[PDB]
Amino acid sequence: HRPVEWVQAVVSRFDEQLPIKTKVSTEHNKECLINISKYKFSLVISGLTTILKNVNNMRIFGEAAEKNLYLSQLIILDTLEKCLAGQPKDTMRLDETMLVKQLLPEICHFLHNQHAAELRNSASGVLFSLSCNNFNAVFSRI
Amino acid sequence: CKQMDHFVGLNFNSNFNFALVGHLLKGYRHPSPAIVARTVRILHTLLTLVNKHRNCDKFEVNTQSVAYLAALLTVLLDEEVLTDPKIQALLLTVLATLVKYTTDEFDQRILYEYLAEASVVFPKVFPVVHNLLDSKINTLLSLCQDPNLLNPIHGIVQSVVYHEESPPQYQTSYLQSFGFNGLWRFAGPFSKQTQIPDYAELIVKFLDALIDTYLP
């Protein structure tokens, strides 16, 4: 259990492989995150969403913003794509737990300059993959 | 001779053949490579004799000859030849001890392949040694950059996280149960304290036993 906590070290390795914070190791790390997310799902998505919230709140002044944020948002979002399409298919209810922590970053994404447009497609695909299960939470909010 | 097996933690009565291998495991940690060559010569000569007990079983896997092959795989794992819970745990401890102290990358990879094979093959006894390589795997996942090295590590992690959901029927303390605790203690590096330990006092009585039975 507590030796199996290596998944958090995998999350931290994914942080060190972020462009804002060897590429074969990044590919193997991403593939392992997707492979773990089939069986153990909540820890992987919780870690990745803490990552995306952190990437949202850092480093605005540099050009490192407009290039590394631009790449890293696609990296986090397509890992979320392959995680949600890795067939969890169980509710594990989490209606106000983590999905509420999902949707405010999501409307932070597609609430509203040149770099935004293809991020909107990836966020829309993320919502498309996400709303295959638990329609009731977003229905109650809407 | 009961009392020394309590302190060194290797019981000859529990398993002779694995305990002699566990005694010879510190020969790989010798500073002299000639001693290592003598150690593997001992392992080969013991292998020839334990296969000479059987009929023409030299370099084929059977239970009375598994452990030497473990000690020889640095320089398979059939479930039906042995069918025993203790022997899988003992061989897995032997492999993990051969992992933790060696720093050779080729030996690390050739042991991680057999280890990830054993993770899929034997999930029921795999949480026994799990804390022993917990010290290695945490650094390996964070720092190492060789995909050939990490792929058996990755397979080990996927095998552990898939089969974690069962309660541990064989945990880490199971080694303490049948009197073979501290195999990692004996196979470690030399202490360089150059101090004789306490239990050697008991060994003194061991020697003064033997004389009283053997000259007259």
Q: What is the DSSP string of B46-99?
A: HHHHHHHHSSS-TTS--GGGHHHHHHHS-----STTT--HHHHHHHHHHHHHHH
Q: How far apart, in Å, are the Cα atoms of A100 and each of A96, A103, B184?
A: 5, 5, 48
Chain A residues in contact with B156 by the CB 8 A cut-off are none
The rounded distance, in Å, linking the Cα atoms of B70 and B59 is 12
Question: Does A6 contact B162 at a Cβ distance shorter than 8 Å?
Answer: no
User: Per-residue b/e over B47-70, b at no fewer than 16 CB within 10 Å?
Assistant: beebbeeeeeeeeeeeeebbbbbb
Nearest Cα residue to B94 out of B175, B38, B3: B175
- Which residues fall within 8 angstroms of residue B95, CB to CB, at 6 or more apart? B70, B73, B111, B114, B115, B118, B129
Amino acid at A102: Q
Task: Assess A121–B contact: CB distance below 8 Å, yes or no.
Answer: no
Question: Does B150 contact A1 at a Cβ distance shorter than 8 Å?
Answer: no
Q: How far apart, in Å, are the Cα atoms of B193 and each of A34, A35, A77, B7, B186?
A: 48, 46, 55, 19, 15
Residue with tokens 């991403």: A30
Burial class (CB in 10 A: 0-12, 13-18, 19+), A36: buried
The rounded distance, in Å, linking the Cα atoms of A125 and A141 is 19
What does the CA dihedral A78, A80, A84, A85 come to, rounded to 10 degrees? Answer: 20
The rounded distance, in Å, linking the Cα atoms of B12 and B89 is 17
Nearest Cα residue to A47 out of A73, A11, A76: A11
The SS3 assignment for B139 reads helix
Task: Assess B141–A contact: CB distance below 8 Å, yes or no.
Answer: yes
Name the residue among B130, B142, B161 with its Cβ closest to that of A13. B142
Burial class (CB in 10 A: 0-12, 13-18, 19+), A2: exposed
DSSP H or E segment with residue B135: helix B134-143
Residue of A15, A17, A25, A31 to mutate for B, most B C-beta atoms under 10 A: A25
Chain B residues in contact with A16 by the CB 8 A cut-off are 142
- Quick one: DSSP state of residue B165? T
Resolution (A): 3.6
Name the residue among A3, A7, A9 with its Cβ closest to that of B131. A3
Burial class (CB in 10 A: 0-12, 13-18, 19+), B99: buried
Amino acid at B110: I
Beta carbons of B58 and B48 less than 8 angstroms apart: yes
Beta carbons of B3 and B202 less than 8 angstroms apart: yes
Q: Which residue of A has its CA nearest to B139?
A: A9
Beta carbons of A2 and B158 less than 8 angstroms apart: no
Residue with tokens 């040694």: B129
CA–CA min distance A92, chain B (Å): 16
The rounded distance, in Å, linking the Cα atoms of A37 and A39 is 6
Nearest Cα residue to B92 out of B62, B120, B51: B120
Task: Assess B166–A contact: CB distance below 8 Å, yes or no.
Answer: no
Task: Assess B130–A contact: CB distance below 8 Å, yes or no.
Answer: yes
DSSP H or E segment with residue B174: helix B174-177
Task: Assess B137–A contact: CB distance below 8 Å, yes or no.
Answer: yes
Output B159-166 pairs: Cβ under 8 A, ≥24 positions apart: B159/B116, B159/B119, B159/B120, B159/B123, B159/B126, B160/A4, B160/B119, B160/B126, B160/B130, B161/A4, B161/A7, B161/A36, B161/A39, B161/A40, B162/A39, B163/B123, B163/B126, B164/A1, B164/A4, B164/A40
Q: What is the 3-state secondary structure (H, E, C) of A13-72?
A: HHHHCCCCCCHHHHHHHHHHHHHHHHHCCHHHHHHHHHHHHHHHCCCCCCHHHHHHHHHH
Nearest Cα residue to A123 out of A141, A142, A137, A104: A104
Strands (E), chain B: none
The rounded distance, in Å, linking the Cα atoms of A36 and B202 is 51
- Which residues fall within 8 angstroms of residue A88, CB to CB, at 6 or more apart? A37, A38, A41, A133
Amino acid at A51: I
Task: Assess A36–B contact: CB distance below 8 Å, yes or no.
Answer: yes
Nearest Cα residue to B183 out of B30, B40, B10: B10
Beta carbons of B161 and B130 less than 8 angstroms apart: no
The shares of helix, strand and coil residues in chain A, as percent rounded to the nearest 5, are: 70, 0, 30
Amino acid at B175: L
Beta carbons of A126 and A103 less than 8 angstroms apart: no
Beta carbons of B36 and B212 less than 8 angstroms apart: no
Instruction: Classify the C-alpha dihedral B43-B203-B97-B193 as positive or negative.
Output: negative
